[PDB]
Amino acid sequence: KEPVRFGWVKGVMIRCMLNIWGVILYLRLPWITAQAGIVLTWIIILLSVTVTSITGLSISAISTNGKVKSGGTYFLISRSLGPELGGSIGLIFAFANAVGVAMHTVGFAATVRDLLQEYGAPIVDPINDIRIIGVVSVTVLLAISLAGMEWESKAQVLFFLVIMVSFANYLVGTLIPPSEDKASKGFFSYRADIFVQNLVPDWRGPDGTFFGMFSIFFPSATGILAGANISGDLKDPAIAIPKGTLMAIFWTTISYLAISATIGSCVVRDASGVLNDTVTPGWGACEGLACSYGWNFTECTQQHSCHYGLINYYQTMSMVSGFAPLITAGIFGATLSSALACLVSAAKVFQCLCEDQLYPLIGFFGKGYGKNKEPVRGYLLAYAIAVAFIIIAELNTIAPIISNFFLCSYALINFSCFHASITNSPGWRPSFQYYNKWAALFGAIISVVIMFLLTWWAALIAIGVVLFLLLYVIY
Template sequence: MSSVSNHSLAARQASGQASGHGFGTITGVFTPCVLTILGVIMFLRFGFVVGQAGVVGTIAIVLFSNAITLLTTLSLSAIATNTKVEGGGAYFLISRSLGAEFGGAIGLVFFAAQALSVAMYVIGFTEALLTYLPEGISPTLVASLTNVAVFGCVAIGAGWTLKIQFLILASVLVSLLSFYAGAWNAFDLETLARNRGPGFTGGETFWTMFALFFPAVTGIMAGANMSGDLRNPARSIPLGTLTAVFVTGLIYLSEAILIGGCRDREALITNNLVLSDIALMPVLIAAGVFAATISSALGSMMGAPRILQSLARDRLFRTLEPLGVGSGSNSEPRRAILVTFLISQAGILLADLNSIAPLITMAFLVTYGLLNLATFYESITKNPSYRPQFKFCHWTTSLAGAIGCGVVMLLIDWRWAFVSIALFAALHWYLSKIDLSADWGNVNSGLLFERTRKNLLKLEGELYHPKNWRPFVLALSGTGFSRPHLVVFGSWLTSKTGVLTLGQVIPGELDDRHQRRISQERLLHTMIGEHDLNAFPAVVVASDYVSGVEALVQCQGLGRLRPNVVLLGCPLSVDRMKTFGGLLRNLKGLSRSVVVLRRTDDPDDDWQPPSGTVDVWWRGRANGELMVLLAHLLLQNEHWRGRELRLLRVVDNKAGIEEVRKHLDGLLKEARIPGVTKVVVSKDSELAIQTTSRNAAFVFLGMQPPNPGDEEAFFYRTEKLAGGMSRVAFVQSAGGMRLES
């Protein structure tokens, strides 16, 4: 088993994670979000979007995109205010809600998207810069040098990088003011009217434009990605991110209208620097382009390594563990920064801006969808630990966000959507196969609990109709290792249709036996895990064995979902039978069926049954119905398939053979259970049973508890009846089932 238990916390403490930078809302969240959102798409591709989709279509794209990011921000805010947020941003929040498997898969996908975002922003910066450089200079060379510079800045430290963001923000704001001033002078209502509708060319559609634009608004994670470096993440992430969403949304909506009213469609489609042409002072737009694209690249280069570092520290992928090491007092993820640089450089060498953007869109949509899904599950499970301080998120908004992300993925490009989901599913499957054990809780247990709670309440009034009878077996197995035949038989009966509880009684006083009870329960857990059993342990301390069994029988279960079959080992002495007889009578009084298992063989493998038939000796419905049903359940187990059920009865003379056989055949037919019937003529029923079933793999016989004082005679009678047969189950039925049901 691969375990991340306790390692994650230890790694974070050892590396100084707790110290952090202590950034506030403006510095750590709002400004990085705004600078990432108002980036390369706005300056270099927004005019193209307006030209293709038209003003109305662009407004729809902006509103639709912001609706998804707003819903996601609400979910992000709810989860961020419900838990102590450490480094890793969306990865940390999703993994702590949906579990290590979902978190690990989305962590890799989200990291890759952030790393490729660096390439997208660097390529955008290069496109803008090349217009001011002599012709013939290689774009790849310029982009690579820019990428190296971004890498160098971030490698120095997040503190230094974020200090220069206010200068960058000032440059962006000045460039926007220059654009608005120029647009005010150049705005023309007739031009706006001509550009109102779409004018798609070159195979473009509304959804290709949406895919091109959507990465612009994915900057909402820029602040969350810095979660480990924030002074108060629970306050800063909701406030800073929501403010950034509203401010940038208004900027994009106003720009769409102004751009559409300032230039004709051909100029919008063919000129990537149309904002510069519109601006009052074009040089300020150039400064804004450079500042915005570099700041976005810096933001992604800072965020992606922190996701990878958090993922590595959680030890979900052993090959990534070295990347969890931090440098300096602030635990800078310099190793992860290097990996991010290499991925972004690969993106620069292999792709262009238009091809990278849709891929990033899919990765972000998967991440946003899961973040919304995590919040949705947290809400509907009614987990008492889900107490977010952010009150403006409801399960309906989270569900709408998750559905919206899924629908948009399919509408943009269903092929890439399926590829993205398949990649995520493969990562999730891999993490599930290696059996992670994380030291944090997740919503899965809450979801299961809520579903189980509702189902138990429904079962309370419906469970005990004979048609719904299932074996709920309490096997008095001791430690399990001491009575393996009871564990094995109980598992055979319940593996597909029932519930198995392994019970143990520790004689003594609770004060003296408390620690032993804990250790014995742990041993039962270990055995259940080693044999992959579908079972629960139950250990009780009682003054004596009988009192302990009776306490377990009465207290196990919830409501009417409680043990209906008690599985016991057969006493091998008269003295034990004297105590055992009283227990059988009390269990009958408690309306519990009892199966007493007597086994004389000593197989090499307890889980491998012997060859032969499974014989049920019928003496009437009192115990017979339960015996036939248990035999049928036994034969449904994969270990017993291929063996034959025989329903047998002893009669005194031949005159009744035909009538009895028809009766037995009718029983099996009504019960819809395959098997054969046989009638044995004999005056000595014990001898007939031993002779007929001496080669059987298993034999079911009925019994009734002995009357007080008859325990010794009962012991010798059962011993004589079982004789030399290797495996015999004596069944005492409390009813509750019918074969014909």
Template sequence: MPAATDASEPKGPSFGTFGGVFTPCTLTILGVIMFLRFGQVVGQAGLWAALAVVLASKAITTLTSLSLSAIATNTRVRGGGAYYLISRSLGVEFGGAIGVLFFLAQAISVAMYVIGFTEAVVATYPTLAPHSVTIASFVNMAVFVCVYIGAGWTIKVQYGILAVLGLSMLSFYLGAATDFSTTLLADNLSPHYREGQGFFTVFALFFPAVTGIMAGANMSGDLRDPARSIPRGTLAAVVVTSLIYLTLAVLLAGVRPHEELIDNNMVIRDVAVWPLLITAGVFAATLSSALGSMMGAPRILQAFARDEVFPWLKFFAAVSGPSREPRRATVFSFVIAEACVLLGDLNAIAPIITMFFMITYGLLNLATFYESITRNPSYRPTFRYCHWSLSLLGAVGCLAVMLLINWLWALVAIAVIGAIYAYIRFMEIEGRWGDLRGGVAFERARQALLRLEEEAYHPKNWRPVVLALASSAWSRPLLAIYGQWLTAGHGVLTLAQVVRGDVEDHAERRQRYENALKTFIAKEELRAFAAVVVENHLSDGVESLVQCHGIGGFKPNTVLFGWPKSESASLAFGASLRLLSRLRRSVICARLTADNAPPEPGMSEQQTHDALWDAPVGTIDVWWRGMQNGELMMLLAHLLQRNPEWRRNQIRVLRVVPNAEAISDVLDHINELAAASRIRVEPVVVVSNDAMRTIRETSAAAAIALLGFEAPVEGDEAAFYLRMEHLAGGLPRVLFIASAGGMALDS
């Protein structure tokens, strides 16, 4: 079975938010439609409907930008833009299909913009019409050379183009301010549709103008800080261009009658104070769009080739020069664009290119929706202004726009992407990176259990599958309640019990205990399963449960114990800990001394239940001693805080150091851990030569403390028990944790 790899990407030249994201997005959005077709939109639809067209179009791209921002801040973004983000969420099949289509759409778009540039030149200088193909090829070559030299050079060129575009808009605004007429504005408020035209046809004409939001994301591999630059630059471009289009609509409605707005494609030039600047603006808009597509296409192909979805594309994964440019992929993009330039008329395939862009945006929204709705613990975006409902609305909006623009081409585009998806699935190509397929299968366990079993494991999809053990009947519900809190609706909790004796003699008893457990689960409103085994010895029962309970991805990876009440139980307890260590299971030992008091006299059953479910006041203290147990401790603290009862409890990550000189380095280390894990914590460093006393004193008022440990060696059980008891001292609530691995903070 071939496998798509997740190769690391070398660090190339880095650009900031303005140059790497805002500029290419803005230049792609403010394109030829603004200069040559927006007057027609206002003239036919009227001002009110034109404003509605702009706002509706921007609403869809804003929703997509929010999804893009969320998913870009939830993963370490490398080159490939939308392809990389979609493939890492929806899997190799959707990622591969998007990689092919998005690359082709970008490469062919270069030809479209080059031909648009040539048409503008010919319209300005009609004597050059016989040489239009030569001019187009020359411009395509010039675009190719700029990009081949490197992204740094191209960004500088785009700065100049942005300046020209700004001057051309200033020229129009000054002219419109002089010619503005409230009488014309009043007449242009209502629609003046020509025969066969309506709101939706005008909407379809305008919408491609706002589809440039991925221009910055396509540069993801060249950004200094993609997680910061992509959200800020993309949303800033959406806001700025929205203001431009809205003010442009008002001014156009007030400077020319609707007949001229509809019939004169160069009405903006006629209104401007300096018409030559509008001509330069048209040239700049088409040229900048061509440059943006020529920069984006090879980077998508390079990222796609690096993942080895199709091994025969690996040739294009190479980088060139000190700035590590994708020059092989750039040459191939140029060849495709030139072939389309020589064909001349791209009207036949232009609609399906637009559909490919829309499918990309729709799938990006869908990826963010699934990341959120499956409640994957690894989905922790630092961008907070996106909800699953907005992502779903964006996906539905993209589909609606596709059908609105051209339902036939929409179906063709969907069929093409479906065929590529089916081919990749038929070839059984595996993605060696974490994606949502395991998470979706987990949430739909009964329907997708077999698929979950076949999924390649990745730390990104780690979830707590907790087996909570008690040696007698579940008379202490706190262990079960903490088990539910630690899974936080993201994992699976099983309440287990070992019945001492022979299975032939105690089969009926085993069933009674299981029924009692199910009754307990229903009474306490737990989302948990019940498991009971009959064994002669507790350690044998633990071994049976850990090895045999669960199916596929639902096998327990974490065992939750209650801490022994006395030293006499330490021998059997230590043996169980060693067994679980050998079986590669994480262990949580809950020492809950403050919460084991009987209910107060006179309390009703409901009051007792509510008291048990009240989270204690204080912080969640994670005592850091390294990654071995620290990763699991951090994730469990995060999951604990996700519960409504614990949301007001701040997570503290604490460490004891022997001298003050180490404080700065340790604080930096903790802050880096927090940033990588996207978990909000308060770092605390305490200088002390007595770690045990410091832990007891510092966490005395904590709601709960998390401390790591290692299973005791044989013969050291009693000393281990006394040592841990001394460490915890009078702390009211302690979780002793031993991690078996399998999770990663930065996944």
């Protein structure tokens, strides 16, 4: 009974694309497009996908160096900077993945709760909705993931199809001439006037700055290592990991640019929401862009007190669409798939750390064999952390620390590549064509600059945890 192996389009490309896409695509990108206009939004996107392209090239170069087992992403850190930054960064990576599982299942449970609160009676508590729904969802994901690897692959293909259907729904919705309901909320079809008026920023509110929008977006463009954590479950990784990872990054960035450039030329940043604001012939004068189509939104701009339009209403994308519930389906598919990718990623790193002879820290976790060619001993450890961080259910303060645990790995992977390449390390001969030491050095420096720049105390906590593990292991 041979194990199942995957090609490059279902085992690498789909996984990375589905882990990069989140709910920022559906709830915040249309808002960032309004705060910062179109050109600066493109600049933010192209700055974010430059760090993850350099890390992508380093990962691709790592993959063409030989055969590495599923979850041996930190082996280069270990054999280039000693086996005590190997295990420490591996443990940080595999703990942050198992926390990201919870930070996604909570986001899915929030949507389920929001739908339940309108269509029927919820159960008594306002926040225990999230806890019960999150725990049930995590148990279902654990069950399907523990039933094999073909089943996880089929579920991921299903989520991909649902996301594509939501994209098509959006794109055919924007081409429909506006109805009164859609017009009165700020939607007109592709107009040249609304495109030009939206190319320049309009910073509004306490969080409306270029660095604020960069800090909102950047953590949702990472997630490129989801096809390299299962390196051993591919038919030939040395051709499948470079091409799959880079195609994922390319197509994700294209979809990020198209959505902003199209939503930025259909909706105005201010709208009333009440249909009694048509033009009255002889209403003195009106000030605003929308009069030339037949709508009068002066009271908003004078008083700054309406809830609709691109800059005020967070769910504009779900009202431009032809059929609204398909966008909710897209949100479900974009959140569950990220949770599943993170749960399969944290299992295959705990299972590599539990069988690492050179890092005996947690090698004592073995009681039951579970020999089904599956990491049963690495799934329960991830499940326990995932549930323990769903019971808390309040995770907006832990997000910076986890997001910096994920950049302490982007720094050490890139620096391990550079250090092994300048030292001429004995056994480091990557054959990937597009790779350079100085690009890796730049990536390793920027990944620390950004990490301290986003929030300075969480970066210190992230460094302190790694340093404590390092020192306790040495002594």
